[PDB]
């Protein structure tokens, strides 16, 4: 019965590819050729969150676009004030190994987890005055690569054991499970409406999931290497996946296929983090080549280089108000560009 | 600065705390521990030392060793091996009572992030390897081996085979042999760490 199932799967893949290619009436390039280019975008280092003594792995902006949380392997997750350079909090992490850090939209909660297979929850507004551990979310058999807060109660965590999970911080038990990936799920990004999310795994596939009943809606392929970054478009109708092959593409949910690719001859280092702008025109994609380019998400061309780091960047987040972008590289210096 | 003065004061106090913690965390020595599954990883320093990563620490002759027994991570090596770029020395353990360990050593000794990091090697299970050689020839594990089947020469050939997989002369493999019961492992780790510490100190001062 294996042969029949394999033939059915091959026919289904062929018909899916035919349907996807049948809707590509016009490419995005000949549509974006009508806009004048945005021109060179120059951003100066307005601030620098000095105070870290290890490699930076996360920089998540608050909903007020003033508080940024940075996580490092020194064992501390310092919460910064982006206007006055001040450090609001310094959470002592249980384990130095951290590759993701989440900031709740309401600002009360901070999530952080790494190689421990545990996504710990930190309560910023504790009555005792000190930040403490709220809920330790255990249950994964692989490293937690990305965790994002849907709301104050539910957090969607991406693990390295091919299992994107939806949690319940109140009870600490996985309410719903997402499965279907073969490689490590290295990235995750919730939609603006917090009803669905994408995930870019190590097997060069970005599958969008459904938060409610936990079933994959669409699957996207085209990357020849692992996906290190993923993030939704500002409109929620598209997303961009950062691959380790020095290329990032802009998939669309309505078109069910990639629209444009962001590649150049002179770039070979692997992308580490990607993010959009408030209007969605600028795509600040980090790189392992010590810089952090900005991509015109319509014209699909370079518009500037935020080369101000002495090592590879691991996170690049844009404020909720579009005011600034925080690039936290491995050299411990998180710079708040603008 | 109406009440932001106290905000700056808190920032300075916790920055001082961060600096103190950072300079107190540089005392410890990081030792990534690798090897095959059940390859004697947790039977080397049992005279000392206490699901994902497993961290173990012990003190030996005024040194705190951070021994990250990462052997419990059943995932891709590539996606989380850059977190150990700043490791002092990789401790590689190989069981001699059993090609997979050789492949792992080849992949890890020539890794992009481990160009200048010495990779110690612990050829373990001396007695078991000796009995296996006395009962079975090394052709089973090493078909290309061409020599008498005894303990010393076969062990030397295996050690040379592991060492020859190095391709960068900027690193040296501190090969060693243990009988799964000797306590000399701590001394070997200590002297290797002393050597690499001296090398790093000379590198920092513009001397190595």
């Amino acid at each position: 019965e294996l042969d029949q199932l394999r033939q059915e799967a091959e026919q289904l893949k062929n018909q899916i590819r035919d349907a996807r290619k049948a809707c590509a009436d016009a490419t995005l390039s000949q549509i974006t050729n009508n806009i004048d280019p945005v021109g060179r975008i120059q951003m100066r280092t307005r601030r620098t969150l000095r105070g870290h003594l290890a490699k930076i792995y996360a920089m998540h902006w608050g909903t007020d676009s003033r508080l940024l949380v940075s996580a490092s392997q020194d064992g501390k997750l310092i919460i910064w004030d982006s206007y006055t350079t001040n450090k609001v909090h310094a959470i002592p992490l249980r384990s130095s190994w951290v590759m993701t850090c989440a900031y709740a939209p309401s600002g009360n909660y901070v999530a952080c987890g790494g190689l421990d297979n545990i996504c710990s929850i930190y309560n910023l507004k504790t009555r005792e005055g000190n930040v403490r551990v709220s809920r330790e979310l255990a249950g994964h058999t692989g490293y937690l690569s990305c965790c994002r807060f849907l709301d104050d109660n539910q957090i969607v965590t991406s693990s390295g054991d091919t299992t994107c999970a939806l949690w319940d911080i109140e009870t600490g038990q996985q309410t719903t499970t997402f499965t279907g990936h073969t490689g490590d799920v290295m990235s995750l990004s919730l939609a603006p409406d917090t009803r669905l999310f994408v995930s870019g795994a190590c097997d060069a596939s970005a599958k969008l999931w459904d938060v409610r009943e936990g079933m994959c809606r669409q699957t996207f392929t085209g990357h020849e290497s692992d996906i290190n970054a993923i993030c939704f478009f500002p409109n929620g109708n598209a997303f961009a996946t950062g691959s380790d092959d020095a290329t990032c593409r802009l998939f669309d949910l309505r078109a069910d296929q990639e629209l444009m690719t962001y590649s150049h001859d002179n770039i070979i280092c692997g992308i580490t983090s990607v993010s959009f702008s408030k209007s969605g025109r600028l795509l600040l994609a980090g790189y392992d080549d010590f810089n952090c380019n900005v991509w015109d998400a319509l014209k699909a061309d370079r518009a500037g280089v935020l080369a101000g780091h002495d090592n590879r960047v691991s996170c690049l987040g844009v404020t909720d108000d579009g005011m600034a972008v925080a690039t936290g590289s491995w050299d411990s210096f998180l710079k708040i560009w603008n | 600065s109406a009440e932001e003065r106290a905000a700056l004061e808190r920032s300075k106090a916790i920055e001082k705390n961060l600096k103190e913690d950072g300079i107190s965390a540089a005392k410890d020595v990081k030792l990534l521990l690798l090897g095959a599954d059940n390859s004697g990883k947790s039977t080397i320093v049992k005279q000392m030392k206490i699901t994902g990563i497993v961290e173990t620490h012990f003190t030996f002759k005024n040194l705190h060793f951070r021994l990250f027994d990462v052997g419990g991570q059943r995932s891709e090596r590539k996606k989380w091996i850059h977190c150990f770029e700043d490791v002092t020395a990789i401790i590689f353990c190989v069981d001699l009572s059993d090609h997979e360990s050789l492949m792992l050593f080849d992949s890890i000794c020539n890794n992009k992030f481990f160009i200048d990091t010495s990779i110690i090697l612990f050829l373990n299970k001396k007695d078991l390897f000796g009995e296996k050689i006395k009962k079975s020839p090394l052709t089973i594990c090493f078909p290309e081996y061409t020599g008498p089947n005894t303990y010393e020469d076969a062990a030397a050939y295996i050690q040379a085979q592991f060492e020859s997989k190095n391709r960068s002369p900027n690193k040296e493999i501190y090969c060693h042999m243990t009988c799964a019961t000797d306590t000399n492992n701590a001394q070997v780790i200590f002297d290797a760490v002393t050597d690499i510490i001296i090398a790093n100190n000379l590198r920092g001062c513009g001397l190595y």
Partner: single-chain antibody, 231 residues
């Protein structure tokens, strides 16, 4: 949970000495800059001193400087020396933290009674008694000598409610934000120079004495004190 108990009262002869100790238990004491606020038996509250986290800086009032010593085992100390005839009051130990979005003067100590035998910003509450019935809408207006809205946009007009026989509790801080554990019935207002603490659907637990507070700069001068009498 959070408690700031204290002791060290009793009759003190004029010109004598006494020790006031604030025993803060149940929270991270070392991260809070404890204040000290007193209140005459028939007058409004008045600031006394201030010690930061780790004793980095210690401030004092105009009539407090020199003869009072504030020091910090999870205990805050105040040293009473050369007690005049105006030192009689009830002394309140008040914790406070200052970061982005913080809630200064969140918890006030129970207080102990002590008895004896002009360049600052003054707080003026011209109204002294607003008689209202339960379920009605009331407003308590407090005025300022100089504008409190700083350059960053934050105005320092803290609102405190003191029920009869109870320690004061923060209700509205920064004239717009609302403190934790406070029902949405109380709502801050005001802009620039004049401030009001609007009350919506006033209940039987909202009756007491209000004390508008400024925090633009030291000393911390309280308002005159408005008593929201029932009916």
């Amino acid at each position: 949970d959070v408690q700031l108990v204290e002791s060290g009262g009793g009759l003190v002869q004029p010109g004598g000495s006494r020790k006031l100790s604030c025993s803060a238990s149940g929270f991270a004491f070392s991260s809070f800059g404890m204040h000290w606020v007193r209140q005459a038996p028939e007058k409004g509250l008045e600031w006394v001193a201030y010690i930061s986290s780790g004793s980095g800086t210690i401030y004092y009032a105009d009539t407090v400087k020199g003869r009072f010593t504030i020091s910090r085992k999870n205990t805050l100390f105040l040293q009473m020396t050369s007690l005049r005839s105006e030192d009689t009051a009830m002394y309140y130990c008040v914790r406070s933290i200052y970061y982005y979005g913080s809630s200064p003067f969140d918890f006030w100590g129970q207080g102990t009674t002590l008895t004896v035998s002009g360049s600052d910003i003054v707080m003026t509450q011209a109204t002294s008694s607003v008689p209202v019935t339960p379920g009605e809408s009331v407003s308590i207006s407090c005025r300022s000598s100089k504008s409190l809205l700083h350059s960053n946009g934050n105005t320092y007009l803290y609102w405190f409610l003191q029920r009869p026989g109870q320690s004061p509790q923060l209700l509205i801080y920064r004239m717009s934000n609302l403190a934790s554990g406070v029902p949405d019935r109380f709502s801050g207002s005001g802009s620039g120079t004049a401030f009001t603490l609007t009350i919506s659907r006033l209940e039987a637990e909202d009756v007491g004495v209000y004390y508008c507070m400024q925090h633009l700069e030291y000393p911390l001068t309280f308002g005159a004190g408005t008593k929201l009498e029932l009916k």
